[PDB]
Design an enzyme around this catalytic site. Structure first.
Site, PDB file in Angstrom:
ATOM      1  N   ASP B  43     -59.314  -4.941 -52.348  1.00 17.98           N
ATOM      2  CA  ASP B  43     -59.555  -5.183 -51.050  1.00 17.98           C
ATOM      3  C   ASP B  43     -60.437  -3.905 -50.388  1.00 17.98           C
ATOM      4  O   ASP B  43     -60.280  -2.596 -50.849  1.00 17.98           O
ATOM      5  CB  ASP B  43     -58.499  -5.574 -50.057  1.00 17.98           C
TER       6      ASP B  43
HETATM    7  C1  LIG Z   1     -50.381   9.635 -36.389  1.00 12.11           C
HETATM    8  C2  LIG Z   1     -51.163   8.241 -36.168  1.00 12.11           C
HETATM    9  C3  LIG Z   1     -50.799   7.525 -34.737  1.00 12.11           C
HETATM   10  C4  LIG Z   1     -50.343   5.906 -35.035  1.00 12.11           C
HETATM   11  C5  LIG Z   1     -51.726   4.843 -34.813  1.00 12.11           C
HETATM   12  C6  LIG Z   1     -51.638   3.363 -34.317  1.00 12.11           C
HETATM   13  C7  LIG Z   1     -52.343   2.514 -34.916  1.00 12.11           C
HETATM   14  C8  LIG Z   1     -51.700   1.016 -34.793  1.00 12.11           C
HETATM   15  C9  LIG Z   1     -50.878   0.481 -36.277  1.00 12.11           C
HETATM   16  C10 LIG Z   1     -51.077  -1.038 -36.581  1.00 12.11           C
HETATM   17  C11 LIG Z   1     -52.509  -1.339 -36.872  1.00 12.11           C
HETATM   18  C12 LIG Z   1     -52.955  -2.603 -36.309  1.00 12.11           C
HETATM   19  O1  LIG Z   1     -52.700  -3.139 -35.213  1.00 12.11           O
HETATM   20  S1  LIG Z   1     -54.290  -3.868 -37.082  1.00 12.11           S
HETATM   21  C13 LIG Z   1     -55.605  -4.126 -36.226  1.00 12.11           C
HETATM   22  C14 LIG Z   1     -55.543  -5.702 -35.400  1.00 12.11           C
HETATM   23  N1  LIG Z   1     -56.315  -6.687 -36.023  1.00 12.11           N
HETATM   24  C15 LIG Z   1     -56.692  -7.099 -37.101  1.00 12.11           C
HETATM   25  O2  LIG Z   1     -56.077  -6.511 -38.076  1.00 12.11           O
HETATM   26  C16 LIG Z   1     -57.756  -8.192 -37.264  1.00 12.11           C
HETATM   27  C17 LIG Z   1     -57.846  -8.842 -38.723  1.00 12.11           C
HETATM   28  N2  LIG Z   1     -58.563  -7.724 -39.602  1.00 12.11           N
HETATM   29  C18 LIG Z   1     -59.297  -8.245 -40.568  1.00 12.11           C
HETATM   30  O3  LIG Z   1     -59.552  -9.733 -40.868  1.00 12.11           O
HETATM   31  C19 LIG Z   1     -60.189  -7.311 -41.686  1.00 12.11           C
HETATM   32  O4  LIG Z   1     -60.283  -7.922 -42.829  1.00 12.11           O
HETATM   33  C20 LIG Z   1     -59.138  -5.828 -42.111  1.00 12.11           C
HETATM   34  C21 LIG Z   1     -57.619  -6.269 -41.742  1.00 12.11           C
HETATM   35  C22 LIG Z   1     -59.629  -4.853 -41.373  1.00 12.11           C
HETATM   36  C23 LIG Z   1     -59.313  -5.900 -43.588  1.00 12.11           C
HETATM   37  O5  LIG Z   1     -60.521  -5.912 -44.158  1.00 12.11           O
HETATM   38  P1  LIG Z   1     -60.856  -5.731 -46.052  1.00 12.11           P
HETATM   39  O6  LIG Z   1     -59.408  -5.931 -46.652  1.00 12.11           O
HETATM   40  O7  LIG Z   1     -61.985  -6.850 -46.087  1.00 12.11           O
HETATM   41  O8  LIG Z   1     -61.399  -4.354 -46.117  1.00 12.11           O
END
Ligand SMILES: CCCCCCCCCCCC(=O)SCCNC(=O)CCNC(=O)[C@H](O)C(C)(C)COP(=O)(O)O
Ligand SMILES: CCCCCCCCCCCCCCCCCC(=O)OC[C@H](COP(=O)([O-])OCC(O)COP(=O)([O-])OC[C@@H](COC(=O)CCCCCCCCCCCCCCCCC)OC(=O)CCCCCCCCCCCCCCCCC)OC(=O)CCCCCCCCCCCCCCCCC
Ligand SMILES: CCCCCCCCCCCCCCCCCC(=O)OC[C@H](COP(=O)([O-])OCC(O)COP(=O)([O-])OC[C@@H](COC(=O)CCCCCCCCCCCCCCCCC)OC(=O)CCCCCCCCCCCCCCCCC)OC(=O)CCCCCCCCCCCCCCCCC
Ligand SMILES: CCCCCCCCCCCCCCCCC[C@@H](O)O[C@H](CO[C@H](O)CCCCCCCCCCCCCCC)COP(=O)(O)OCC[N+](C)(C)C
Ligand SMILES: CCCCCCCCCCCCCCCCC[C@@H](O)O[C@H](CO[C@H](O)CCCCCCCCCCCCCCC)COP(=O)(O)OCC[N+](C)(C)C
Ligand SMILES: CCCCCCCC/C=C\CCCCCCCC(=O)O[C@H](COC(=O)CCCCCCC/C=C/CCCCCCCC)COP(=O)(O)OCCN
Lengths: 69, 88, 104, 459, 56, 178
Positions: B43
């Protein structure tokens, strides 16, 4: 392995520097030699009292031979 | 003196070493020209971790626009050679 | 003609190094350029800069600084032995001054 | 004194009877020899001046100015012969004639015994300068610049003439020795206030004083290289020399009439120094640094103390040399890239290593690094100003901080960083340019060992 | 052959002789300001038995 | 820095860049490798939790809240590679990079040394001269009448052709020029 080093042309700066050095020394070295020869063999004058009835020349009021000249 | 004159074969060896140390990809199947998606079924998120591992291995940062494209070990080797000016 | 006049195109600048790789940047003619360099260097660095600096360094003491030091030493010696003040508050003698009649 | 004037006058027929390809050589050699002869005037007395004749005299204030004036002509000829290559023979000779006439007028101006003769020569210096600017300047603004140069000066000096012939009608003479010995106090009256203004504003415009300094960023920028060199090095010092000469008649009126000019100078120092921080034109930055430096000379002359006069003389000489060198350094880059924008050509230290050293030394002298005579003059003026009022240290201190900022900024923009990629016509430095820089900088450093030669009649 | 040098290098003596002439014109000027020669209260002096003027 | 940029970044690109940035800052916070591995696996799980969300409004809102989380939780002193834009060796060797056109101004005595290098340089210059018109022709034919939409350049499509606008890319000074 040894590689080529890309540099700006350093020829002209070096030529100018050696030209300036030569043309300064051409007169400076003779001047320095003359000054030290005068100093060693014709020293400074010695302060004395003016003898009675004698009027010194205007250059006889300085002690260094080059300044007197 | 400083670091030795790193060569193309060394870059390839280190890239394949790092890849073979990845649990997701088996050592026998992996090849220099293997695509990370078609060949290994990996992925996009997985791919990002490989790029970061290559950065940690060679000690330099690959820009995100440049990084996404690299899908084969040969591509990574060519990118690193282009950056470090490696011609053999 | 959508041009307002007949005019020469703006010509590109000449590199003196193209025809004289050791050009000195004084003139297009190599001999004249080389003699311009030699004459500037000799009359600027050898004559005015060195000989002029030497001449100025050994200028006679027409400012009378050593003379003033000698005179000051003489008066300090004379005054100290005498017991007189080293320096006087008034430069001009009071006897030769005629102040106005009275303070009011 | 004719032993300097007459050889200078012989430079005209010599130039006009020279071969088409020998004018620069002859002019350079013989102007250098005239500088050598001029060095003899530095032998000054401690009590009175060198009174050659009824017409010409030399003092410890005018002798260094004369030496700088004669020394500047060979440097101007060296700096001019590159961009005048395609010129016709007769126009080259006319340009050299303009320079020779300018030198002749300046030499007589600095040594005239009588104030009307001084005025006539000090005004005659306008004609060759204006012709140089408006005939050999490169852009269309050079015409306007000329007008600004012409009418700012004259509007100041026309009252001065009216004052001078007035003074001779009441005191009987304009001879400077008689003026000094027979001096009398100026009463506190409206007529005396306007006579004071008429004797001062002409010199203030030449300095120039902050507020009437607009002509300078135009004239210096649009002028050819020799024009800007002579404008900065010598023509600005005419105001300082004239103010120093004419202040004797002014007392005790100067104590209260100097306040507006002291405020204008002490604030315009900050104003122009800060203007240098945001200047897209390199030659314009160099021009504004001159106004910032001459504000200090104005302050030193207005406060009227021996330390201030010594400092003003030293600063005038040091600024002449440094500003001339900076204008030449900018012209070296202009003749490569044909633009005065400072950020157009960058990273030049990589491509021109020794010219970078020249740039560094010029910038160091501009910010008055000790023990350069720039610093000597600046520090003497600052000490005298502190005596005049302690609060001045705040303004003076601020100016020093700003001056270093725009100097090194000027150095960092043009020499450091990375060279612009498109430019590919940056040729190696010529011997002519390197020698032109050396002949600016070596006398400056050499004057550190004998500063009494440039400290004026108050030493 | 002398003309091949002189006829194109005589402009090289204009400023030298112009200097020499200048010095001469100074000396003549000094001859018009002798009203106090050996007459000042600071330098008044008895002449040496052979000298005629204290300065020229 | 070698690929041409696009008009915008897609949602997938934004979330991937966020993942890499958050992992790097997490590694800055977790100095030790085992602790970094632990919390990086936790981070990957947190990213995978919404891997297949199909509501683009919900996905955008989740990405925005993730950005707001990162900005508050970022390391104020993140680790930077030494030659990266914020690093301690970013542009350290730029003072040593000299353009090759400077070699044209060398004095003939300077060129007397290195005769083979300058013969090879003459061959390179002849090659550059001989292929310029073909490259210009290729660019004009390939590009649209309005102009080029993107900064991507075409390869050489004939045999004896070089890719257009190649000289300055090929003749880069070096990364360690001296
Ligand atoms: C020290 C660090 C500080 C903390 C940072 C905080 C960050 C937030 C933590 C949680 C992360 C989120 O919310 S996650 C963001 C919220 N929305 C989504 O995930 C929508 C669905 N994504 C997809 O469909 C894509 O395919 C994808 C998943 C990109 C993969 O793609 P490949 O597989 O085709 O590469
Ligand atoms: C390279 C190109 C780039 C250019 C760069 C830019 C330059 C541009 C061009 C500028 C042109 C220059 C123009 C300037 C001219 C000015 C000349 C001048 O005025 O001279 C003045 C001055 C001379 O003064 P003076 O008034 O004429 O003499 C007065 C006395 O009457 C005389 O005293 P005396 O009679 O008792 O004896 C003294 C005499 C005699 O001396 C002796 O013999 C005594 C020595 C004693 C040695 C003891 C042991 C040796 C022998 C022992 C063994 C023998 C016996 C046993 C044998 C057995 C062996 C065991 O020696 C001299 O006279 C000195 C000679 C003067 C030389 C001047 C140099 C400048 C010339 C101008 C041109 C320069 C152009 C460059 C070319 C230079 C060429 C060199 O010259 C000096 O140099 C003096 C300097 C001495 C200072 C010593 C050091 C002090 C250290 C303090 C500082 C420490 C702080 C750290 C800083 C250190 C930095 C160095
Ligand atoms: C204390 C030092 C002792 C010195 C011993 C005697 C040395 C005499 C040298 C006199 C100055 C020469 C004229 C300057 C133009 C140089 C012409 C040139 O292009 O040379 C290239 C030549 C060939 O190199 P290259 O590989 O072709 O260069 C390629 C690039 O251009 C790459 O070139 P680069 O990157 O090597 O750049 C050249 C280099 C050097 O270039 C320069 O910076 C020359 C100008 C120095 C700064 C002057 C402006 C700042 C305002 C202060 C002015 C002070 C004047 C003092 C009187 C000077 C009389 C001539 O740059 C620097 O090293 C940094 C300069 C900043 C100096 C910071 C310290 C300032 C205060 C020092 C104390 C001053 C008073 C001392 C006495 C105190 C009480 C004991 O390099 C040299 O031969 C060395 C240059 C000389 C460095 C001397 C630095 C100290 C100068 C102190 C003033 C003189 C004092 C003398 C009496 C004893 C003290
Ligand atoms: C490229 C490599 C660079 C480094 C290598 C170079 C090697 C070292 C060379 C540098 C020497 C360092 C200088 C050290 C100081 C010693 C020199 C000093 O002794 O000379 C001074 C003398 O200097 C002169 O006085 C100053 C020279 C005047 C400069 C005039 C410039 C020439 C005219 C050019 C026109 C410019 C216009 C100027 C407008 C005013 C001392 O003055 P003074 O205390 O008395 O002498 C006492 C003894 N006397 C009186 C009997 C003579
Ligand atoms: C931008 C650059 C321009 C150049 C700057 C030049 C600055 C020129 C300023 C002149 C300095 C002072 C001038 C006269 C001295 C005092 C002026 C006045 O303000 O003070 C009072 C003067 O009294 C009244 O105020 C009269 C003056 C009021 C009318 C003049 C208008 C001034 C407004 C400012 C005009 C802007 C000047 C620049 C024009 C372009 C003093 O009180 P008083 O005891 O009674 O008078 C004593 C004077 N005595 C001895 C001669 C009798
Ligand atoms: C680049 C801009 C520079 C501007 C400079 C202009 C300002 C010059 C200063 C005023 C010039 C005229 C002064 C006249 C010369 C003085 C000689 C004198 O002493 O005459 C006065 C007379 O003084 C005057 O008449 C001058 C009055 C003003 C006349 C012209 C007005 C000019 C404008 C005045 C204000 C501007 C000055 C400052 C402006 C600075 C520049 C912005 C007294 O003589 P008596 O009549 O005999 O008196 C004793 C016996 N009764």
């Amino acid at each position: 392995k040894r590689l080529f080093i890309i540099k700006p042309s350093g020829f002209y700066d070096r030529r100018f520097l050696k030209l300036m050095r030569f043309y300064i020394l051409l007169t400076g070295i003779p001047v320095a030699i003359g000054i030290t020869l005068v100093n060693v063999f014709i020293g400074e004058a010695e302060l004395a009292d003016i003898p009675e009835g004698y009027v010194p020349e205007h250059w006889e009021y300085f002690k260094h031979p080059i300044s007197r000249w | 003196s400083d670091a030795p004159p790193l060569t193309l074969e060394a870059i390839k060896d280190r890239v394949l070493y790092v890849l073979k140390l990845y649990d997701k990809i088996d050592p026998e199947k992996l090849s220099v020209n293997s695509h990370f998606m078609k060949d290994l079924g990996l992925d996009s998120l997985d791919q990002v971790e490989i790029i970061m591992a290559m950065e940690d291995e060679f000690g330099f940062e690959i820009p995100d626009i440049d990084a996404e494209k690299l899908m084969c070990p040969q591509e990574i080797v060519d990118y690193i050679a282009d950056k470090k000016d490696v011609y053999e | 003609p959508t041009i307002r006049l007949q005019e020469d195109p703006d010509p590109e600048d000449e590199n003196l190094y193209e025809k004289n790789p050791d050009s000195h940047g004084y003139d297009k003619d190599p001999i004249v350029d080389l003699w311009n360099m030699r004459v500037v260097f000799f009359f600027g660095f050898s004559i005015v800069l060195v000989l002029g600096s030497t001449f100025v360094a050994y200028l006679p003491d027409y400012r009378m600084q050593e003379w003033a030091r000698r005179e000051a030493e003489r008066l300090v010696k004379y005054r100290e032995a005498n017991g007189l003040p080293l320096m006087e508050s008034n430069c001009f003698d009071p006897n030769k001054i005629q102040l106005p009649e009275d303070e009011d | 004194m004719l032993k300097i004037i007459i050889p200078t006058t012989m430079l005209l027929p010599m130039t006009w009877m020279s071969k088409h390809n020998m004018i620069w050589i002859n002019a350079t050699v013989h102007s250098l020899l005239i500088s050598l002869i001029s060095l003899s005037l530095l032998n000054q007395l401690g009590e009175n001046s060198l009174n050659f004749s009824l017409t010409f005299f030399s003092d410890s204030l005018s002798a260094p100015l004369l030496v700088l004036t004669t020394w500047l002509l060979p440097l101007m000829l060296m700096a001019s012969q590159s961009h005048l290559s395609k010129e016709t023979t007769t126009r080259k000779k006319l340009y050299i004639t303009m320079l020779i006439l300018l030198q002749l007028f300046l030499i007589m101006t600095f040594t005239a015994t009588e104030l009307i003769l001084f005025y006539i020569l000090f005004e005659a210096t306008l004609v060759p300068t204006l012709i140089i600017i408006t005939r050999w300047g490169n852009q269309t603004e050079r015409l306007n610049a000329g007008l600004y140069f012409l009418f700012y000066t004259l509007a100041g000096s026309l009252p001065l003439l009216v004052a001078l012939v007035y003074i001779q009608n009441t005191t009987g003479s304009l001879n400077f020795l008689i003026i000094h010995y027979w001096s009398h106090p100026l009463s506190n009256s409206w007529s005396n206030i306007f006579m004071w203004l008429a004797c001062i504003m002409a010199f203030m415009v030449k300095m120039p004083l902050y507020g009437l300094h607009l002509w300078l960023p135009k004239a210096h920028v649009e002028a050819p290289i020799a024009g800007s060199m002579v404008l900065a090095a010598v023509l600005l010092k005419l105001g300082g020399y004239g103010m120093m000469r004419i202040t004797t008649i002014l007392n005790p009126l100067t104590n209260y009439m100097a306040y507006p000019f002291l405020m204008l100078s002490m604030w315009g120092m900050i104003m122009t120094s800060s203007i240098c921080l945001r200047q897209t034109d390199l030659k314009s930055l160099i021009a504004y640094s001159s106004v910032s430096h001459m504000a200090l000379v104005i302050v030193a002359i207005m406060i009227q103390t021996p330390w201030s006069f010594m400092g003003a003389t030293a600063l005038m000489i040091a600024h002449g040399l440094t500003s001339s060198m900076l204008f030449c350094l900018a012209n070296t880059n202009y003749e490569r890239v044909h633009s005065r924008t400072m950020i157009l050509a960058r990273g030049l230290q990589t491509l021109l290593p020794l010219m970078a050293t020249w740039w560094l030394v010029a910038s160091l002298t501009n910010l008055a690094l000790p023990p350069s005579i720039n610093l000597i003059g600046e520090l003497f003026i600052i000490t005298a100003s502190f005596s005049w009022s302690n609060i001045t240290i705040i303004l003076m201190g601020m100016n020093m901080m700003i001056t270093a900022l725009y100097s090194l900024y000027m150095l960092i923009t043009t020499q450091r960083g990375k060279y612009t990629h498109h430019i590919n016509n940056i040729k190696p430095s010529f011997t002519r340019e390197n020698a032109l820089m050396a002949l600016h900088i070596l006398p400056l450093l050499l004057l550190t060992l004998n500063p009494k030669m440039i400290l004026g009649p108050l030493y | 052959n002398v003309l091949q040098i002189v006829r194109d290098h005589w402009v090289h003596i204009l400023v030298p002789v112009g200097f020499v002439f200048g010095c001469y014109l100074d000396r003549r000027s000094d001859e018009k300001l002798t009203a106090f020669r050996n007459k000042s209260l600071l330098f008044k002096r008895e002449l040496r038995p052979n000298e005629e003027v204290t300065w020229k | 820095a070698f690929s041409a940029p696009a008009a915008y970044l897609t949602h997938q690109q934004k979330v991937l860049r966020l993942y890499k940035r958050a992992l790097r800052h997490l590694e800055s916070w977790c100095v030790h490798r085992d602790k970094y591995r632990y919390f990086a696996c936790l981070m990957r799980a947190r990213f995978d939790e919404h891997k297949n969300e199909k509501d683009m409004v919900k996905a955008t809102q989740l990405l925005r809240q993730a950005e707001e989380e990162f900005w508050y939780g970022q390391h104020p002193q993140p680790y930077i590679f030494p030659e990266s834009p914020g690093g301690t060796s970013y542009e350290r060797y730029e003072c040593y990079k000299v353009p090759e056109w400077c070699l044209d101004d060398w004095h003939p005595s300077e060129k007397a040394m290195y005769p083979d290098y300058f013969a090879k340089r003459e061959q390179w210059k002849r090659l550059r001269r001989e292929s310029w018109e073909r490259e210009v022709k290729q660019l004009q034919e390939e590009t649209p009448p309005g102009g080029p939409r993107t900064e991507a350049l075409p390869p050489a499509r004939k045999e004896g052709d070089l890719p257009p606008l190649w000289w300055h890319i090929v003749t880069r000074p070096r990364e360690r020029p001296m």
